[PDB]
Amino acid sequence: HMLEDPMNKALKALGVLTTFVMLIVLIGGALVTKTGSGQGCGRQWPLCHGRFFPELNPASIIEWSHRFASGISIILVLSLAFWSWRKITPIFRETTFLAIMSIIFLFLQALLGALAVVFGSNALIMALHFGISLISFASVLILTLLIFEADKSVRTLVKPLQIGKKMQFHMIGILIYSYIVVYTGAYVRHTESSLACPNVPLCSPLNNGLPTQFHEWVQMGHRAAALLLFVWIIVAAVHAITSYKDQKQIFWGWISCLIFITLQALSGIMIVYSELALGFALAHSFFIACLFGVLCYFLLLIARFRYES
Ligand code: HEM
Ligand SMILES: CCCCCCCC/C=C\CCCCCCCC(=O)OC[C@H](O)CO
Ligand SMILES: CCCCCCCC/C=C\CCCCCCCC(=O)OC[C@H](O)CO
Ligand SMILES: [Cu+2]
Numbered sequence: 001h002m003l004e005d006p007m008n009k010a011l012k013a014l015g016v017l018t019t020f021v022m023l024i025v026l027i028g029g030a031l032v033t034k035t036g037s038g039q040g041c042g043r044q045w046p047l048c049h050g051r052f053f054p055e056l057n058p059a060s061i062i063e064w065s066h067r068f069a070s071g072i073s074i075i076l077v078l079s080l081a082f083w084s085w086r087k088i089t090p091i092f093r094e095t096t097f098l099a100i101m102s103i104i105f106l107f108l109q110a111l112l113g114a115l116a117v118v119f120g121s122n123a124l125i126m127a128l129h130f131g132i133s134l135i136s137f138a139s140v141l142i143l144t145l146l147i148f149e150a151d152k153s154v155r156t157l158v159k160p161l162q163i164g165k166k167m168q169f170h171m172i173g174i175l176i177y178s179y180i181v182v183y184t185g186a187y188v189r190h191t192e193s194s195l196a197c198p199n200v201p202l203c204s205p206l207n208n209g210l211p212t213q214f215h216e217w218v219q220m221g222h223r224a225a226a227l228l229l230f231v232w233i234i235v236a237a238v239h240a241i242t243s244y245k246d247q248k249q250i251f252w253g254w255i256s257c258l259i260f261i262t263l264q265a266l267s268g269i270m271i272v273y274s275e276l277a278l279g280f281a282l283a284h285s286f287f288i289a290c291l292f293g294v295l296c297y298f299l300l301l302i303a304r305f306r307y308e309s
Contacts, residue, residue, distance in 0.1 A: 002151065011083050012151070015144030018076040021069045022137040025109075026130075026289055028066040030281040034113065034129060035120025035190065040067055043278060070110075077106045077140060084147055091150045092158075094303060098143040105136035120190070127186035130285075131179055137289060138296040145297065157297065161247050163305045170236035171302060174229070175295040181229045182288060184222040193218035194276055200269050226265060233261045249301070253294055260291035
């Protein structure tokens with residue numbers, strides 16, 4: 001393919017690896033405790049540090065794979081940030097903002113995680129971790145995307161598209177609002193309001209399906225926030241399907257968004273129905289990661305378009 005130094009495809013490999021590790025650090029948090037002394041241990045049995053005799057269990061692998069990914073992340077993120085900065089910036093000026101964002105948020109989630117070991121009883125603060133971890137992953141994802149695009153003459157995704165004002169409103173607005181919905185979700189978890197409402201869409205058989213207790217309000221607030229996000233994405237997708245059919249990155253970008261929002265909602269409903277089976281929890285952290293990734297891709301398009309035009 002390219003006669004340039006073979007070491008370049010290694011920067012692409014590092015990008016893929018780091019993006020993957022950061023995704024693991026994020027979604028892996030749905031399987032292990034993120035607060036208290038049992039932090040790092042499978043959520044179903046907070047005791048994995050110390051007393052137990054047995055080893056090589058499928059739940060022990062999760063715990064090892066998460067702590068390993070979290071440790072190796074510092075090495076990977078710093079290397080990716082530096083290398084991409086040295087090599088990719090000439091073509092993409094955004095490279096530096098991303099390299100920096102990657103480092104800052106990797107450190108912020110590590111900082112918040114360290115504190116969660118002892119202040120995990122503060123749900124309002126603990127609910128900030130996911131969103132931070134989410135941006136840490138999305139920064140590395142977009143950086144990796146630029147790394148690939150930098151080595152192509154006819155770019156696939158990072159193309160100078162014409163983004164109208166309305167579409168910009170939807171993109172930026174949905175991005176910001178999704179982050180808010182992400183907080184309410186994290187708040188449900190760390191406030192233990194996950195199973196306060198056995199039913200869906202309403203709370204339970206009693207009180208007409210309306211919340212009457214703390215945990216029911218948190219649960220219901222999250223669902224209500226999610227519904228609005230869902231509706232907004234439908235409106236945003238319809239505008240793309242109608243006015244951006246000629247700009248396929250936006251057309252398909254939003255259709256994928258529509259699909260990720262659907263899978264997010266469904267896995268959310270299954271968390272409840274399954275009474276928090278961790279497989280659905282894992283899915284619920286994954287699909288929002290995909291959606292947010294696409295929304296951050298859109299933000300890059302706007303950032304470049306506003307620079308160009
Ligand atoms: C489609 C838009 C939705 C988004 C963007 C979203 C996002 C999130 C996020 C980021 C978390 C936090 C996870 C964590 O801190 O490990 C969460 C948790 C949760 N969500 Fe959603 N969510 C959505 C919809 C729903 C729906 C429609 C339901 C249910 C009817 C639901 C039920 C839950 C439950 C029960 C938790 C707590 C899980 C736990 O204790 O680990 N979500 N959500
Ligand atoms: C423990 C293991 C650590 C190692 C993990 C390795 C992960 C390899 C992943 C990708 C390789 C990227 C190779 C890039 C090849 C250059 C050509 C290219 O850019 O292909 C792009 C592709 O089609 C898309 O757009
Ligand atoms: C149209 C909006 C429907 C929202 C329903 C939410 C529930 C389905 C969730 C994900 C599937 C997404 C499938 C999107 C199918 C779009 C088909 C399309 O793009 O047809 C356009 C045509 O070629 C030119 O006008
Ligand atoms: Cu309680």
